[PDB]
């Protein structure tokens, strides 16, 4: 630590104690259901650009591998999750959203983004969780007569909020001047039909979207991964799973007043206090394992190797990852005595160290003020010195320190 | 605003105003010594237990080893300002078992060993009055353990690596050497801090700290009771100004509140994101791939690294200004506890006579007894007398009339005194000397040498 | 007993050594050397790197000065607490307690010294004390006699004045003794007679 | 004569001086201006800068 072969007489910090996991308990709710994504996932079409659909999934053992064996998709191009890491995490609700689109449309349909589909047809939320999945379905919308079943919006008064649909085939008049079953006379039908042919360009090709946009909610979790379930431990430190939410601590059971729709208890530094337990109803409260740091107690090397360990913090009967009991933690290697001496090395309150004669050894001690004096004093006497001496101390004081220079541009860069 | 009374004082080239009657005062000084010792972990703040985590953080350089040393600098100094502060004294001097020292009632300052921890009633008040946080120097990870009602902002502070150090000497050993400091200042005077402890009965020592002052000895041994009285007074209206109003330790206060709400600054800046996408590093390294994880997890090191500096370099300025302020209170036990200070407005507003110190939590308290004259009187002065063609000027003391006779007294009490060649001198003639009035001057030569 | 100067060395040194050593860090880059970052990529990813490279070099060199700046302000302190010392103990005497050595003040000599001042305080301190019997005031014809400089003491049989810090006993006489009052007021008069020359 | 005070004076000018000029620095961005970055891009890469 010290970066040397030699070390001095004193108290030094060298690195910090932990008391490792011992198990690892996955808690995790148990459901037979199986979600519905190979019932609903393949169809021989979808719906209209403006009018979507929406499927519920909920309450089931999710699968995710079923991607690759049905659609033949480029990417899963996925924000904010992994698609390897769904195994895993147990989510709140799956929303599958399945239509159809245009070529110049995979990029325009993301968050933060603007266009003309965006503005009416599908919008997404900036901050959301679960991702878009697209591929080519050229030939999959390629009749030979054309595609104009699928509709398209390009007008409206005003905006139109995320995860919304339209359906609606009313007229828009851009002016004061109304219609009311003509078009033509400054106002068109909003709603517009699809160019989609077999020999087309290749920059409006016909694709498909499904989508599997997950959210991250404190509501009570239904869909989950495949996992199994472990019994309960107290009183350990172990890693737990409750639900998703990782960590590390001891699970004492809790004296709290939880109400029937508080599950998760918070923390000031947003880390997590109580859980509910995914399996029962029953709260038990997390504390994290014992920690602190270590100090070494050392002479110097030129005098003795003999060194002492303080564990800082600690009522050591949980010490390992003489023996004594310490305000400032306890020490281990040295005696204590019942002696009084000048302090040497500084350990805690009121306790320190030194290296003594009385075969050698480390020796901890309370340290003394002074001598015990108590000087005659009665309202009649006094006392009076007769001789004395001259004596010349020393008294030390720094003034200066060196001065020095730095450019920037020879330091961060260097011509 | 207003900036106080209005005053007109009536001056005159002949006229002079001399107390006649003084009061004793006790005031009372806080001053701050040492702060909270404190020790931070990187690992477990910016990381905790996170390989990961810890694997960024290594790119970082050497940071963190010189955030370590500068929070161990801090707290070496601060059982350093207090080892200045108190230890000055050699040996433990301890009262004798007669509590007679001339009338004065010292029994509010000295301790009592009815109670385990030996401190006097001044100091349990000073004790009580300072609420303290109870912060982590108390071992506490038992009753961390134990969920007791609802978490503990204490145990909230050490589950994220902040740990505090308890200090080197206890409150037991600073109460020890303040009774230690008390008996040498009762029995020995300032004998004590200049050698050897020396005994001298009370009223001849206040004698000496009256003729520090300018004042003769006989105004105290002519008025002992009523400065004792005086004194005994004081010390009551101590006692009951601290058991009635409670602002006036605000300065430790501060002290303890300044730390508390340091330390909860840095546990609530744990929550933030930086620009994440969550602040717990478990979430996303279960939710995201190999790279973008390593993203979010470089930028709350970044920004977890930024609060940690900003901590310490508010500790270090902290500290710098504690230890300017351990520097003045030792120069004050120093000058106004072991000696009497000549210095104007140290120790205490008024002449000094004698300081006590009482240990608080985080400081020290001083009682510094003065003197401060009361009761003053109009009379017509002059600078010097002729007398046979000779300009006499008075040797310690000055010329006053009463209207009809002329006298010399001392400056800062009324003892009116015949003016006779022995309390004055002679220098030149009548005729240099502007304002010289014509009296004349006793000779006791003459009676005697005529009988 | 020089380890104050030493410190002041130490710290200087090792502040620069971390300076230096702050320079072989990637701060979250592909190279902590820069030339190699200009001759393995192309414009823009060398530009990020440059970036990274420069966020964590300022951020130490801002560190480096800001505890460069507390130093200071602390070694400013310190000068000036020696620059009053030099003026108050070296030219002169100082009546003031713990200032200028422990004991009564005589002398001080500065000594210059690397980064620093040392001065040699000389100074007196009593040693062999003894005990003796005192009184206030001494009761003579109805009169009581207080000392002008110095104290009453007594051997068991005979009183004399003597100075505070030196045994230095004298026959009590009205040259040294002034006259205030009666014996009727003050506690612990005692009764002696009073030498007339 | 009075060069304490006037120093006194002139730290306080010179460090709201350059703590104004310091808004006109990219620090490594497209613009100093920030109605420029919000009307110039879309809404991440404005968040990036
Ligand atoms: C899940 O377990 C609980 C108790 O362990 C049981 O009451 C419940 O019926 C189970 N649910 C299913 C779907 O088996
Ligand atoms: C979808 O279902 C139809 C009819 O059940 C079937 O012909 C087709 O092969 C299925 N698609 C896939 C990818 O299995
Ligand atoms: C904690 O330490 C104290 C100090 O010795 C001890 O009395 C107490 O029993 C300890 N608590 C335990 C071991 O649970
Ligand atoms: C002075 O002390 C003696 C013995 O210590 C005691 O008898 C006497 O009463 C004391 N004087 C006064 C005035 O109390
Ligand atoms: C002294 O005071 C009186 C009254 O104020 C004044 O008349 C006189 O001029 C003063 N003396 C001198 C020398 O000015
Ligand atoms: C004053 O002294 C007497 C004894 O001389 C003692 O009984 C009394 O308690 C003292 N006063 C106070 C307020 O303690
Ligand atoms: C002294 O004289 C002045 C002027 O006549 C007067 O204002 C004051 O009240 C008198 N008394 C005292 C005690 O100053
Ligand atoms: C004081 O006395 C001298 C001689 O006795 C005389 O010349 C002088 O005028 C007197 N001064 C006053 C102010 O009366
Ligand atoms: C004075 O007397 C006390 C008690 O009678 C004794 O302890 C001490 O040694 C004596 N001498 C001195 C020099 O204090
Ligand atoms: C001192 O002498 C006076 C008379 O001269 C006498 O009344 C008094 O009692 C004496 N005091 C002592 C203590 O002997």
């Given at each position: 630590?010290?970066?040397?072969?030699?070390?001095?007489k004193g108290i030094y910090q060298?690195?910090?104690?932990?008391?490792?996991?011992?198990?690892?308990?996955?808690?995790?709710?148990?459901?037979?259901?199986?979600?519905?994504?190979?019932?609903?996932?393949?169809?021989?079409?979808?719906?209209?650009?403006?009018?979507?659909?929406?499927?519920?999934?909920?309450?089931?053992?999710?699968?995710?591998?079923?991607?690759?064996?049905?659609?033949?998709?480029?990417?899963?191009?996925?924000?904010?999750?992994?698609?390897?890491?769904?195994?895993?995490?147990?989510?709140?609700?799956?929303?599958?959203?399945?239509?159809?689109?245009?070529?110049?449309?995979?990029?325009?349909?993301?968050?933060?983004?603007?266009?003309?589909?965006?503005?009416?047809?599908?919008?997404?939320?900036?901050?959301?969780?679960?991702?878009?999945?697209?591929?080519?379905?050229?030939?999959?919308?390629?009749?030979?007569?054309?595609?104009?079943?699928?509709?398209?919006?390009?007008?409206?008064?005003?905006?139109?909020?995320?995860?919304?649909?339209?359906?609606?085939?009313?007229?828009?008049?851009?002016?004061?001047?109304?219609?009311?079953?003509?078009?033509?006379?400054?106002?068109?039908?909003?709603?517009?039909?699809?160019?989609?042919?077999?020999?087309?360009?290749?920059?409006?090709?016909?694709?498909?979207?499904?989508?599997?946009?997950?959210?991250?909610?404190?509501?009570?979790?239904?869909?989950?991964?495949?996992?199994?379930?472990?019994?309960?431990?107290?009183?350990?430190?172990?890693?737990?799973?409750?639900?998703?939410?990782?960590?590390?601590?001891?699970?004492?059971?809790?004296?709290?007043?939880?109400?029937?729709?508080?599950?998760?208890?918070?923390?000031?530094?947003?880390?997590?206090?109580?859980?509910?337990?995914?399996?029962?109803?029953?709260?038990?409260?997390?504390?994290?394992?014992?920690?602190?740091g270590?100090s070494?107690?050392?002479?110097?090397?030129?005098?003795?190797?003999?060194?002492?360990?303080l564990?800082q913090?600690?009522?050591?009967?949980?010490?390992?990852?003489?023996?004594?009991?310490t305000r400032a933690?306890?020490?281990?290697?040295?005696?204590?005595?019942?002696?009084?001496?000048e302090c040497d090395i500084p350990i805690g309150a009121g306790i320190c160290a030194?290296?003594?004669?009385?075969?050698?050894?480390?020796?901890?001690?309370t340290m003394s003020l002074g001598?015990?004096?108590?000087?005659?004093?009665?309202?009649?006497?006094?006392?009076?010195?007769?001789?004395?001496?001259?004596?010349?101390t020393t008294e030390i004081l720094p003034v200066?320190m060196?001065?020095?220079?730095?450019?920037?541009?020879?330091?961060?860069?260097?011509? | 605003?207003?900036?106080?009374?209005?005053?007109?004082?009536?001056?005159?080239?002949?006229?002079?105003?001399?107390?006649?009657?003084?009061?004793?005062?006790?005031?009372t000084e806080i001053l701050p010594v040492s702060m909270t010792k404190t020790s931070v972990?990187?690992?477990?703040?910016?990381?905790?237990?996170?390989?990961?985590?810890?694997?960024?953080?290594?790119?970082?350089?050497?940071?963190?080893?010189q955030l370590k040393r500068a929070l161990t600098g801090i707290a070496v100094e601060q059982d350093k300002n207090t080892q200045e502060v108190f230890a000055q004294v050699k040996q433990i001097?301890?009262?004798?078992?007669?509590?007679?020292?001339?009338?004065?009632?010292?029994?509010?300052?000295?301790?009592?060993?009815?109670?385990?921890s030996?401190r006097?009633?001044i100091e349990?008040?000073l004790f009580?009055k300072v609420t303290l946080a109870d912060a982590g120097f108390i071992?506490?990870?038992?009753?961390?353990?134990?969920?007791?009602?609802?978490?503990?902002?204490?145990?909230?502070?050490?589950?994220?690596?902040l740990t505090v150090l308890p200090p080197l000497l206890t409150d037991e050993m600073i109460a020890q050497y303040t009774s230690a400091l008390l008996?040498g200042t009762?029995?020995?005077?300032?004998?004590?801090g200049?050698?050897?402890?020396?005994?001298?009965?009370?009223?001849?020592?206040?004698?000496?700290?009256?003729?520090?002052?300018?004042?003769?000895?006989?105004?105290?041994?002519?008025?002992?009771?009523?400065?004792?009285?005086?004194?005994?007074?004081?010390?009551?209206?101590?006692?009951?100004?601290?058991?009635?109003?409670?602002?006036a330790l605000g300065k430790l206060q501060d002290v303890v509140n300044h730390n508390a709400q340091a330390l909860?600054?840095?546990?609530?800046?744990?929550?933030?994101?930086?620009?994440?996408?969550?602040?717990?590093?478990?979430?996303?390294?279960?939710?995201?791939?190999?790279?973008?994880?390593?993203?979010?997890?470089?930028?709350?090191?970044?920004?977890?690294?930024?609060?940690?500096?900003?901590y310490v370099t508010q500790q270090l300025i902290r500290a710098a200004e504690i230890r300017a302020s351990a520097n003045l209170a030792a120069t004050k036990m120093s000058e106004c506890v072991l000696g009497?200070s000549?210095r104007?407005?140290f120790c205490?507003?008024?002449?000094?006579?004698?300081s006590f110190p009482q240990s608080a939590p985080h400081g020290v308290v001083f009682l510094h007894?003065?003197?401060?004259?009361?009761?003053?009187?109009?009379?017509?002065?002059?600078?010097?007398?002729?007398?046979?063609?000779?300009?006499?000027?008075?040797?310690?003391?000055?010329?006053?009339?009463?209207?009809?006779?002329?006298?010399?007294?001392?400056?800062?009490?009324?003892?009116?005194?015949?003016?006779?060649?022995?309390?004055?001198?002679?220098?030149?003639?009548?005729?240099?000397?502007?304002?010289?009035?014509?009296?004349?001057?006793?000779?006791?030569?003459?009676?005697?040498?005529?009988?």
């Amino acid at each position: 630590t010290l970066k040397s072969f030699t070390v001095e007489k004193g108290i030094y910090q060298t690195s910090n104690f932990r008391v490792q996991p011992t198990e690892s308990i996955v808690r995790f709710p148990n459901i037979t259901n199986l979600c519905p994504f190979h019932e609903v996932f393949n169809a021989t079409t979808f719906a209209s650009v403006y009018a979507w659909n929406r499927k519920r999934i909920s309450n089931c053992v999710a699968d995710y591998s079923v991607i690759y064996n049905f659609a033949p998709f480029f990417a899963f191009k996925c924000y904010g999750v992994s698609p390897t890491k769904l195994n895993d995490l147990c989510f709140t609700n799956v929303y599958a959203d399945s239509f159809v689109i245009r070529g110049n449309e995979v990029s325009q349909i993301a968050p933060g983004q603007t266009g003309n589909i965006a503005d009416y047809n599908y919008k997404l939320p900036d901050d959301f969780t679960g991702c878009v999945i697209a591929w080519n379905s050229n030939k999959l919308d390629s009749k030979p007569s054309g595609n104009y079943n699928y509709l398209y919006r390009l007008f409206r008064k005003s905006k139109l909020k995320p995860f919304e649909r339209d359906i609606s085939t009313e007229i828009y008049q851009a002016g004061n001047k109304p219609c009311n079953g003509v078009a033509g006379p400054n106002c068109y039908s909003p709603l517009q039909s699809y160019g989609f042919r077999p020999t087309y360009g290749v920059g409006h090709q016909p694709y498909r979207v499904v989508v599997l946009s997950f959210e991250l909610l404190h509501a009570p979790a239904t869909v989950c991964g495949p996992k199994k379930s472990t019994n309960l431990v107290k009183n350990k430190c172990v890693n737990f799973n409750f639900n998703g939410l990782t960590g590390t601590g001891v699970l004492t059971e809790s004296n709290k007043k939880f109400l029937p729709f508080q599950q998760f208890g918070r923390d000031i530094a947003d880390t997590t206090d109580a859980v509910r337990d995914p399996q029962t109803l029953e709260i038990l409260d997390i504390t994290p394992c014992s920690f602190g740091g270590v100090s070494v107690i050392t002479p110097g090397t030129n005098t003795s190797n003999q060194v002492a360990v303080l564990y800082q913090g600690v009522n050591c009967t949980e010490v390992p990852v003489n023996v004594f009991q310490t305000r400032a933690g306890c020490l281990i290697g040295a005696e204590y005595v019942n002696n009084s001496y000048e302090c040497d090395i500084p350990i805690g309150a009121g306790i320190c160290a030194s290296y003594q004669t009385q075969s050698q050894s480390i020796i901890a001690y309370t340290m003394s003020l002074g001598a015990e004096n108590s000087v005659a004093y009665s309202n009649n006497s006094i006392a009076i010195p007769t001789n004395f001496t001259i004596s010349v101390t020393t008294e030390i004081l720094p003034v200066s320190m060196t001065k020095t220079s730095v450019d920037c541009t020879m330091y961060i860069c260097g011509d | 605003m207003s900036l106080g009374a209005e005053n007109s004082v009536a001056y005159s080239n002949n006229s002079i105003a001399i107390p006649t009657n003084f009061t004793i005062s006790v005031t009372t000084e806080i001053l701050p010594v040492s702060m909270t010792k404190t020790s931070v972990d990187c690992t477990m703040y910016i990381c905790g237990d996170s390989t990961e985590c810890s694997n960024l953080l290594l790119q970082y350089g050497s940071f963190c080893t010189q955030l370590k040393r500068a929070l161990t600098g801090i707290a070496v100094e601060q059982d350093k300002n207090t080892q200045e502060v108190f230890a000055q004294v050699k040996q433990i001097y301890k009262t004798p078992p007669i509590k007679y020292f001339g009338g004065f009632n010292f029994s509010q300052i000295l301790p009592d060993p009815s109670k385990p921890s030996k401190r006097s009633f001044i100091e349990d008040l000073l004790f009580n009055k300072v609420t303290l946080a109870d912060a982590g120097f108390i071992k506490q990870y038992g009753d961390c353990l134990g969920d007791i009602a609802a978490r503990d902002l204490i145990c909230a502070q050490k589950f994220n690596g902040l740990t505090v150090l308890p200090p080197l000497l206890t409150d037991e050993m600073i109460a020890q050497y303040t009774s230690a400091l008390l008996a040498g200042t009762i029995t020995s005077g300032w004998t004590f801090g200049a050698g050897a402890a020396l005994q001298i009965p009370f009223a001849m020592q206040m004698a000496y700290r009256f003729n520090g002052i300018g004042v003769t000895q006989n105004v105290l041994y002519e008025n002992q009771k009523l400065i004792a009285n005086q004194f005994n007074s004081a010390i009551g209206k101590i006692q009951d100004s601290l058991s009635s109003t409670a602002s006036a330790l605000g300065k430790l206060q501060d002290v303890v509140n300044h730390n508390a709400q340091a330390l909860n600054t840095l546990v609530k800046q744990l929550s933030s994101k930086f620009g994440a996408i969550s602040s717990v590093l478990n979430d996303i390294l279960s939710r995201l791939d190999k790279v973008e994880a390593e993203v979010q997890i470089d930028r709350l090191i970044t920004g977890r690294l930024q609060s940690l500096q900003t901590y310490v370099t508010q500790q270090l300025i902290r500290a710098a200004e504690i230890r300017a302020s351990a520097n003045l209170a030792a120069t004050k036990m120093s000058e106004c506890v072991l000696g009497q200070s000549k210095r104007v407005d140290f120790c205490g507003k008024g002449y000094h006579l004698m300081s006590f110190p009482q240990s608080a939590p985080h400081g020290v308290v001083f009682l510094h007894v003065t003197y401060v004259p009361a009761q003053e009187k109009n009379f017509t002065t002059a600078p010097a007398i002729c007398h046979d063609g000779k300009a006499h000027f008075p040797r310690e003391g000055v010329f006053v009339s009463n209207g009809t006779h002329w006298f010399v007294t001392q400056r800062n009490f009324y003892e009116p005194q015949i003016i006779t060649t022995d309390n004055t001198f002679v220098s030149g003639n009548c005729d240099v000397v502007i304002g010289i009035v014509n009296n004349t001057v006793y000779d006791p030569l003459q009676p005697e040498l005529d009988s």
